[PDB]
Write a protein that holds these residues in place. Structure first.
Motif, PDB file in Angstrom:
ATOM      1  N   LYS A 267       0.447   2.121  -4.833  1.00 25.57           N
ATOM      2  CA  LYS A 267      -0.898   2.487  -5.256  1.00 25.57           C
ATOM      3  C   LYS A 267      -1.126   3.983  -5.101  1.00 25.57           C
ATOM      4  O   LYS A 267      -1.795   4.606  -5.932  1.00 25.57           O
ATOM      5  CB  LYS A 267      -1.937   1.704  -4.457  1.00 25.57           C
ATOM      6  CG  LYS A 267      -1.871   0.196  -4.636  1.00 25.57           C
ATOM      7  CD  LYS A 267      -3.002  -0.492  -3.883  1.00 25.57           C
ATOM      8  CE  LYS A 267      -3.261   0.164  -2.535  1.00 25.57           C
ATOM      9  NZ  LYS A 267      -4.546  -0.292  -1.932  1.00 25.57           N
ATOM     10  N   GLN A 268      -0.571   4.577  -4.043  1.00 23.17           N
ATOM     11  CA  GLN A 268      -0.708   6.016  -3.847  1.00 23.17           C
ATOM     12  C   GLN A 268      -0.079   6.789  -5.000  1.00 23.17           C
ATOM     13  O   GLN A 268      -0.691   7.716  -5.543  1.00 23.17           O
ATOM     14  CB  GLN A 268      -0.083   6.427  -2.512  1.00 23.17           C
ATOM     15  CG  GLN A 268      -0.999   6.256  -1.304  1.00 23.17           C
ATOM     16  CD  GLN A 268      -1.524   4.843  -1.155  1.00 23.17           C
ATOM     17  OE1 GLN A 268      -0.755   3.900  -0.970  1.00 23.17           O
ATOM     18  NE2 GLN A 268      -2.840   4.687  -1.237  1.00 23.17           N
ATOM     19  N   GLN A 269       1.140   6.417  -5.400  1.00 25.31           N
ATOM     20  CA  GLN A 269       1.786   7.114  -6.509  1.00 25.31           C
ATOM     21  C   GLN A 269       1.061   6.866  -7.826  1.00 25.31           C
ATOM     22  O   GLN A 269       0.918   7.785  -8.641  1.00 25.31           O
ATOM     23  CB  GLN A 269       3.256   6.707  -6.626  1.00 25.31           C
ATOM     24  CG  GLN A 269       4.161   7.331  -5.576  1.00 25.31           C
ATOM     25  CD  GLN A 269       4.428   6.410  -4.406  1.00 25.31           C
ATOM     26  OE1 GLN A 269       4.374   5.189  -4.542  1.00 25.31           O
ATOM     27  NE2 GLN A 269       4.715   6.990  -3.248  1.00 25.31           N
TER      28      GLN A 269
ATOM     29  N   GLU B 284       0.815  -1.215   0.000  1.00 30.81           N
ATOM     30  CA  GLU B 284       0.000   0.000   0.000  1.00 30.81           C
ATOM     31  C   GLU B 284       0.850   1.267   0.000  1.00 30.81           C
ATOM     32  O   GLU B 284       0.629   2.179   0.795  1.00 30.81           O
ATOM     33  CB  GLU B 284      -0.946  -0.015   1.195  1.00 30.81           C
ATOM     34  CG  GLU B 284      -2.114  -0.974   1.063  1.00 30.81           C
ATOM     35  CD  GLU B 284      -3.393  -0.409   1.647  1.00 30.81           C
ATOM     36  OE1 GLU B 284      -3.603   0.818   1.550  1.00 30.81           O
ATOM     37  OE2 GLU B 284      -4.190  -1.192   2.205  1.00 30.81           O
ATOM     38  N   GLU B 285       1.834   1.335  -0.885  1.00 36.44           N
ATOM     39  CA  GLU B 285       2.506   2.608  -1.115  1.00 36.44           C
ATOM     40  C   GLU B 285       2.591   2.967  -2.590  1.00 36.44           C
ATOM     41  O   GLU B 285       2.439   4.141  -2.937  1.00 36.44           O
ATOM     42  CB  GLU B 285       3.916   2.607  -0.484  1.00 36.44           C
ATOM     43  CG  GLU B 285       4.880   1.571  -1.037  1.00 36.44           C
ATOM     44  CD  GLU B 285       5.687   2.090  -2.213  1.00 36.44           C
ATOM     45  OE1 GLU B 285       5.775   3.325  -2.376  1.00 36.44           O
ATOM     46  OE2 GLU B 285       6.232   1.264  -2.974  1.00 36.44           O
TER      47      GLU B 285
ATOM     48  N   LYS C 114      -8.562   1.056  -3.579  1.00 26.94           N
ATOM     49  CA  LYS C 114      -9.312   1.939  -2.699  1.00 26.94           C
ATOM     50  C   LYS C 114     -10.035   1.109  -1.648  1.00 26.94           C
ATOM     51  O   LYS C 114     -10.469  -0.014  -1.922  1.00 26.94           O
ATOM     52  CB  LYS C 114     -10.312   2.773  -3.503  1.00 26.94           C
ATOM     53  CG  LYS C 114      -9.666   3.874  -4.327  1.00 26.94           C
ATOM     54  CD  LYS C 114     -10.692   4.872  -4.835  1.00 26.94           C
ATOM     55  CE  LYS C 114     -10.190   5.588  -6.078  1.00 26.94           C
ATOM     56  NZ  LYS C 114     -11.132   6.647  -6.536  1.00 26.94           N
TER      57      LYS C 114
ATOM     58  N   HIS D  86      -1.746   9.054  -7.875  1.00 28.35           N
ATOM     59  CA  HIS D  86      -1.234  10.395  -8.127  1.00 28.35           C
ATOM     60  C   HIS D  86      -0.806  10.589  -9.575  1.00 28.35           C
ATOM     61  O   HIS D  86      -0.724  11.732 -10.035  1.00 28.35           O
ATOM     62  CB  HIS D  86      -0.055  10.710  -7.203  1.00 28.35           C
ATOM     63  CG  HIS D  86      -0.432  10.861  -5.763  1.00 28.35           C
ATOM     64  ND1 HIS D  86      -0.419   9.809  -4.873  1.00 28.35           N
ATOM     65  CD2 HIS D  86      -0.832  11.945  -5.056  1.00 28.35           C
ATOM     66  CE1 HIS D  86      -0.795  10.237  -3.681  1.00 28.35           C
ATOM     67  NE2 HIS D  86      -1.051  11.530  -3.765  1.00 28.35           N
TER      68      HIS D  86
END
Lengths: 394, 93, 48, 93
Positions: A6-8, A3-4, B29, A11
């Motif tokens: 996915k953030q980028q 879960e890191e 999500k 973004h």
């Protein structure tokens, strides 16, 4: 992967196609079509624990509106039998037996759920010890028991209630002598606050009922055994009784603030059920009994407002009738009224938090779940304004 | 705007925001219960991959963005673009 | 009749008001009939 | 009745082809030709079986009563209840 990244990737700004696709599917999936009174509702009456042993108090769980806590008090049939018994009865499924059973060494006078702990029942007894019952435990005895020291209650407690926010709770209880005490729900070895209710200097109060106005926890209303209702402040420089009410010439055997919200405020109103068949629609800001419904030969025992009707309120009786008074409809005859069979002395009424159906205690332990008609239960948007007009009448 | 899409999907009845599942079957999500949503989304991924295989068997130029799986309790709309697989639970009413 | 100062005007007003009171007494008879036909139950509130 | 059913189910959109399937796959009926109907409907039968398992995963009591797949090139229908397996070839629009 983790879960890191996915953030980028979110973004990242290649999401025009995704956003167009989402908009298209949502706009195409917007269209949706289909493919193709007073009534006896239920009983609740144990036999092992409910032989005589009249009902004393009733409640419903806020977290579990399908659950009712009773407290059958009086042990006179068999001295060796358990003295105080509180039964909890479920609403989702019909069972002749109570769901869960709790017995206290002394005689329980009052019980209620715990807001913070949805798996816990707190009750007050006749001796004066505030008593817990951890539903997780398999053992029927009280789990945590307040000491009978001069710090805590020493007289038959009659009102127990947990209030406050989920992150800031207080279990308030009041005894007949009038010592109010707040405990922490998780620790009861010591009363985290206490104060003896007193009127004008050197005048003890024989508290026997109370109710908190909705939302407020700092100030409340109490019905004394001496027929004179008061308003008090829980925390503040004026902690204690702050009001005289002339009230009624008999003991106050019930009390309840207004229990509706959404339109013009009525928290200042409450109804007290006296000991001469005189329920009193009546407010804090005034001092004079607004109205004095009277009928009958015997006297009421408890009265609550409807949790959703801004006008309706029930009324216990001595010959066994339960009646509902709809002020907007009428102020003079009970709007609805039916008698329980066998005409025993009813002792407690409690409305479901939904307000769609009522409960009632009994002189023989047979709790009766009654239902009310839709036209007599649910109010309207104009109902609040009609209540405003009826109160502005006099 | 991601939050704009979240509030837009929230407006749809029976829907809790926006949940998007990537090609790994793990939702990028988080809106519902994690274990149930992950296992169920892996099952959706398997079925959409096999359906993709069949549609490419006879229609080698077709793309899947719409699939109406409804039961007598709830409906799921699943929408793959190329990696992001939107899934929206929606009552049949 | 209004600012009228004729005393015979007052007498005509008296005749008008005795017709008034005949309608009033008709209403009295009707409401008392409703009373009596709604009585006989008990004393309390809407009964008596 | 049979012919009236297919006639009304076809002329409702001038459908390219529909056959009635009351058995578990492998239909011998045809509307355009035998192969493209039979093999495609058998593959649809396998996939609706797998989808029935897929929807029973979340709860065994749930069943698939209706399936749409409206893709970029095909709009394929089926309404399974116990053995009634619809097939519809139609334009996406």
């Amino acid at each position: 992967l983790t879960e890191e990244e996915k953030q980028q990737i979110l973004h990242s700004e290649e999401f025009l196609s995704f956003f167009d696709h989402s908009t298209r599917i949502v706009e195409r999936a917007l269209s949706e079509q289909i493919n193709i009174k007073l009534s006896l509702n239920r009983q609740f009456f144990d036999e092992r624990w409910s032989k005589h042993r009249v009902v004393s108090c009733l409640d419903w769980s806020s977290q579990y509106p399908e659950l009712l806590v009773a407290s059958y008090n009086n042990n006179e049939d068999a001295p060796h039998e358990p003295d105080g018994v509180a039964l909890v009865w479920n609403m989702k499924y019909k069972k002749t037996t109570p769901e869960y059973v709790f017995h206290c060494q002394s005689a329980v006078m009052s019980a209620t759920f715990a807001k913070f702990h949805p798996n816990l029942v707190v009750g007050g007894t006749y001796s004066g010890q505030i008593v817990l019952w951890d539903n997780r435990s398999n053992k029927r005895t009280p789990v945590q028991r307040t000491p009978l020291s001069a710090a805590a209650h020493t007289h038959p407690v009659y009102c127990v209630n947990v209030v406050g926010t989920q992150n800031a709770h207080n279990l308030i209880s009041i005894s007949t002598d009038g010592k109010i005490c707040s405990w922490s729900l998780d620790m009861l070895s010591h009363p985290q606050d206490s104060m003896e209710l007193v009127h004008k200097q050197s005048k003890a109060v024989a508290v026997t009922s109370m109710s908190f106005p909705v939302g407020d926890v700092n100030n409340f209303v109490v019905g004394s055994e001496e027929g004179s209702v008061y308003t008090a402040c829980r925390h503040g420089s004026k902690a204690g009784i702050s009001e005289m009410f002339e009230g009624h010439q008999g003991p106050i055997t019930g009390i309840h603030c207004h229990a509706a919200v959404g339109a013009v405020d009525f928290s200042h109103l409450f109804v007290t059920s006296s000991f001469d068949w005189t329920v009193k629609l009546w407010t804090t800001k005034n001092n004079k009994p607004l109205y004095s419904f009277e009928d009958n030969a015997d006297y009421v025992y408890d009265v609550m407002w409807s949790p959703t009707h801004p006008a309706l309120f029930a009324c216990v009786d001595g010959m066994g009738r339960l009646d509902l008074w709809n002020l907007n409809n009428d102020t003079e005859v009970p709007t609805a009224s039916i008698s329980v069979e066998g005409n025993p002395a009813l002792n407690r009424v409690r409305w479901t938090h939904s307000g769609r159906e009522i409960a009632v205690g009994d002189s023989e332990g047979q709790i009766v779940i009654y239902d009310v008609g839709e036209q007599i239960a649910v109010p309207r948007n104009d109902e609040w304004a009609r209540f405003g007009r009826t109160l502005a009448e006099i | 705007e991601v939050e704009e899409t979240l509030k837009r999907l929230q407006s749809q009845k029976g829907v809790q925001g926006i949940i998007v599942v990537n090609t790994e079957g793990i939702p990028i999500k988080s809106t519902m219960d994690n274990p149930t949503t992950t296992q169920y989304a892996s099952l959706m991924h398997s079925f959409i991959l096999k359906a993709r295989s069949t549609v490419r068997d006879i229609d080698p130029q077709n793309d899947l963005t719409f699939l109406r799986i409804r039961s007598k309790k709830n409906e799921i709309m699943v929408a793959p673009d190329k990696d992001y697989f939107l899934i929206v639970i929606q009552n049949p009413t | 009749d209004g600012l009228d100062v004729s005393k015979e005007g007052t007498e005509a007003w008296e005749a008008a008001m005795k017709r008034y009171d005949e309608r009033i007494d008709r209403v009295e008879t009707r409401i008392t009939a409703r009373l009596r036909d709604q009585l006989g139950t008990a004393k309390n509130a809407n009964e008596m």
